[PDB]
């Protein structure tokens with residue numbers, strides 16, 4: 130009850146990033162978190178986006194939850210918001226035609242929700258909590274098998290030959306041809322990271338062809354499209370979003386990248402058209418990091434208070450790891 134945004138702003142002569150700068154999903158604070166400790170469900174592996182696993186609610190905190198990969202090590206646990214599009218209710222993969230990576234010890238054929246729930250004596254999280262159940266409209270113009278050019282987010286200076294390999298509700302999965310699946314990332318039509326076939330060519334940018342493509346220097350889209358019999362995502366399907374309007378020094382709240390259980394008071398350290406650099410007030414600049422303006426883990430001031438999540442105040446002066454802020 131002691132720390133408060135109101136007096137911090139007066140003390141610092143600062144301003145917060147207006148709620149209007151965030152996506153509705155990042156700002157909404159009046160939804161109830163119906164998830165309960167022990168409930169089971171399905172979800173994508175954040176580090177291997179094309180794979181689906183059985184997950185359990187290991188912890189609830191405000192509008193967030195910590196999920197655990199059944200049968201596996203706790204080191205894989207991760208946090209998501211209750212309105213996350215990356216989780217689905219029990220039975221979702223079977224209904225949508227997706228494959229499942231069963232719990233440790235199980236074979237994909239030995240898994241059955243009904244029996245599993247009995248063996249574990251648990252309940253499945255009710256369906257009415259999921260925003261994504263594949264009941265909504267698919268992304269206009271993006272179908273499994275189409276080709277496009279996309280930025281490798283792990284190596285962002287590369288624009289590469291890619292394919293759509295999955296579609297779930299209003300989002301699709303970008304995959305880099307002949308490269309490892311862990312480079313995949315879910316995306317939507319307004320993403321600034323995707324471009325139609327030929328973009329690089331009109332921009333003078335070098336295009337990164339499929340891994341080990343014969344005579345990589347002579348890569349030709351027309352040729353590749355004939356070889357694969359695949360079509361390119363149509364140009365009209367791409368509807369890139371406008372650059373965000375966050376300004377340097379605006380304050381907000383952001384999940385700690387080192388200990389995701391925590392959320393800290395933060396400031397906009399720097400900006401790009403679609404990214405912002407986060408600085409945790411009072412902490413060393415060595416911890417500042419870049420992040421997409423639409424990332425689900427940044428929120429407007431007051432989010433923690435309204436959702437019931439603890440908020441870490443600025444680090445005290447002269448403390449270890451601090452910065453004369």
Ligand SMILES: CN(C)CCCC[C@H](N)C(=O)O
Pocket residue numbers: 281284287289305308312337
């Ligand atoms: C195109 N992209 C999906 C992969 C780029 C990999 C770069 C480098 N060989 C590495 O392995 O880090």
